[PDB]
Design a binder for this molecule. Structure first.
Ligand SMILES: COc1ccc2cc(C(=O)[C@@H]3CCCN([C@H]4CC[C@@H](O)CC4)C3)ccc2c1
Ligand SMILES: COc1ccc2cc(C(=O)[C@@H]3CCCN([C@H]4CC[C@@H](O)CC4)C3)ccc2c1
Lengths: 298, 298
C-alpha cells in the first residue's frame, strides 16, 4: 500500500497529520477536500501532494470546535463557499496602488476592490480570528483569502454584483464597535429632555446624505453627539464635489446601460482615484458619489 | 478528610463532577464560584450543597470551549456579570398577564418587562444557544435567566435605567435575520433605476416615525419593499393614538421627574396595557408612544 503524509485543517492554524492511501480519492478518506481552494474530493493523491495542507469539512467535534473558534459561524456551508471563492480570488492580481493593496479588475469585483481600499484607511478590529488574520495579510499585499472570506461571510459568489455599503455594513457587524456611540437630542420648546443613543454598528453608519457637516447639523430637530473612529455616509449616486481634505475616502458608482462600476477616491496630499489597478490624480473631483467615509484621528 | 460531590459548569448543560474538600473555600478549589447567581467564592462547602450545580469561571480549554459555544462571547467578564444579575432577577416575580410572561416592578426594570413582553410576540431565532434556551424558558414562565442574560449581553446592571429600542436592537444583532430585507427604490424622473437593499438587522428597525403606513408610503422620495417577520418603528415619545388592529405591540414611555417609566400596549381582541404585574384593557389608547412593532403573518 503506497501512501503519503499530508496535513488536514479547517483553519490553517491547527494542522492534523494524516496518512493517505494513494489508491483512494481524497473524498473516500476525508470527505469533501480542498487544496488551496480547488476541490480535490474526486482526485487520487499525487506524489507532489506530500506534506501539503488540505482543507476538509468539519465532520467531527474537534474540527467543529476549531472552525467555530476561527470563523465564528455555525453555517455548515461556510467552508465550501469560502473555498469556492478562494479558488477564484487566488488568481486575481493585488497591485500596490498609492500605498494601498488594490485588486486588478476581474469577475465584476470593483465593489470588492473599493471595499478593500476603504478597509485599509479606517480602524477596524474584527471579532473572528479568520478576518483579523486575513485582513493583516491583505494590508501586507496578499488579499486573496480576505476577499474570499468577505464573499463567504456576505453570501456572495465570485462574479455576483455587489454593493460597497452593504459589504461594509456586514463587516462592521463582525467587528468590535462596542465603544462607538451616537447620541441624538431633540431640540424642542416644550417636550423636555428627549435623548436616544445608538451604540455599536448603528453609530458608524448613516443613510440619506453624504456630507458630515450636513449630518452634524441635525435632520424633528436634533443635536448629534458622534463618538466613533469613523463614520460611513451613503446616499443615492448623484453628482457630488469631493473637496480635498474634507473626507477620508469615498465610493463613486456609475450605472451606464445598467452595468455598474465602482471607483475609489482617497484624500491624501491631493485627490487620488483608484480604479482597480489604475491610478489617477487630480486637484478636484466631481462624480456620482454614493459613499463617503470620515475618520476621527484621535 | 470530609468531602461532598458537586457539579461545576459554565453552561448548565455540561456538568463536571467534583469532590470538594469541606475544609477549604470554593474559591480555593475552583476559583470564583457561584450558586444560583450567589457568589460563594469565600464560603466553605455545606452538607446541603451535596449534588448541587455551581458555576465557575472558564479557566481551562475545556470550560473555555463550552462557554464560547454556549454564550458566543469571549468577554472574560461575561459569566461574572451574568451571575451578578441572576442573583437579583431570580428574586423578581414573573406573573402571567394575558398569556404573556411579565415582570412585577422592581429595580427600575420596566424597560426589561416591556422588552420581555415584546420578545414573546415576535418570532426570533437567537444565535447563542444560551439565549435560545432561556427564551423558551421565559415563554414558559421562568424568565429570570433570560432577563439576567439580556442584562449581561447589553452590559447593563440591575437597577440601571435602560431603553427598550436599544435592548431590542442589541438582541436583534444576536439573532438570525439573514433573510430579512428592505429594498429602497428612488422615485425620480431622470436618475434611472437606483436601488439599495438593507439586509439583516438594518431591515427590521426604523427610526423617525411610528406609523408603518407612513413609512411605506414614502420615506427624496423612495418606494419601500419590506420583507421581514417583524419591524420595529421608533420616534421621540409623543402623544399618539394606537388603533386596535393596526399594530402588534408598542412601548409607552413617560418621563416623570427625569426618572422614566415604560408600559407595554398589545393589540389582541382589544387593547391591553401591561405595566409589569398591572393590566388595563381599553378599546382605545392615547399616550406617549416611542416604539411600535408590526408583524408579517405567514
Ligand atoms: C437612503 O439612502 C441611500 C443610500 C444609498 C443608496 C444607494 C443607491 C444605489 O443605487 C446603489 C449605489 C451603489 C451600487 N448599488 C448596486 C450595486 C450592484 C448591486 O448590488 C445592486 C446595488 C446601488 C440607491 C439609493 C440609496 C439610498
Ligand atoms: C430619531 O428617532 C428617534 C427614535 C427614538 C427616540 C427616543 C427618544 C427618547 O427620549 C427615549 C424614549 C424611551 C426611553 N429612553 C431613555 C430610557 C432610559 C435611558 O436608557 C435613557 C434613554 C429615551 C428620543 C429621541 C428619539 C428619536
Amino acid at each position: 500500500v503506497r501512501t503519503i503524509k499530508v496535513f488536514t485543517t479547517v483553519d490553517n492554524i491547527n494542522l492534523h497529520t494524516q496518512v493517505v492511501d494513494m489508491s483512494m480519492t481524497y473524498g473516500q478518506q476525508f470527505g469533501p477536500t480542498y487544496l488551496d481552494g480547488a476541490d480535490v474530493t474526486k482526485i487520487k493523491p499525487h506524489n507532489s501532494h506530500e506534506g501539503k495542507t488540505f482543507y476538509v469539512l468539519p465532520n467531527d467535534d474537534t474540527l467543529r470546535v476549531e472552525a467555530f473558534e476561527y470563523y465564528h459561524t455555525t453555517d455548515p456551508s461556510f467552508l465550501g463557499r469560502y473555498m469556492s471563492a478562494l479558488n477564484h480570488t487566488k488568481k486575481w492580481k493585488y497591485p500596490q496602488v498609492n500605498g494601498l493593496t488594490s485588486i486588478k479588475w476581474a469577475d465584476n469585483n470593483s465593489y470588492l476592490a473599493t471595499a478593500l481600499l476603504t478597509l485599509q484607511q479606517i480602524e477596524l478590529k474584527f471579532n473572528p480570528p479568520a478576518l483579523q488574520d486575513a485582513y493583516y495579510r491583505a494590508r501586507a499585499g496578499e488579499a486573496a483569502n480576505f476577499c474570499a472570506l468577505i464573499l463567504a461571510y456576505c453570501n456572495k459568489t465570485v462574479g455576483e454584483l455587489g454593493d460597497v455599503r452593504e459589504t461594509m455594513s456586514y463587516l462592521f457587524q463582525h467587528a468590535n464597535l462596542d465603544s462607538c456611540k451616537r447620541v441624538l437630542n431633540v431640540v424642542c420648546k416644550t417636550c423636555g429632555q428627549q435623548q436616544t443613543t445608538l451604540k455599536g454598528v448603528e453609530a458608524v453608519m448613516y443613510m440619506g446624505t453624504l456630507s458630515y457637516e450636513q449630518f452634524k447639523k441635525g435632520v424633528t430637530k436634533y443635536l448629534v453627539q458622534q463618538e466613533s473612529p469613523f463614520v460611513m455616509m451613503s446616499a443615492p449616486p448623484a453628482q457630488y464635489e469631493l473637496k480635498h481634505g474634507t473626507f477620508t475616502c469615498a465610493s463613486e458608482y456609475t450605472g451606464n446601460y445598467q452595468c455598474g462600476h465602482y471607483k475609489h477616491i482617497t484624500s491624501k496630499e491631493t485627490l487620488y482615484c483608484i480604479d482597480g489597478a489604475l491610478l489617477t490624480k487630480s486637484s478636484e473631483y466631481k462624480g456620482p458619489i454614493t459613499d463617503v467615509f470620515y475618520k476621527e484621528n484621535s
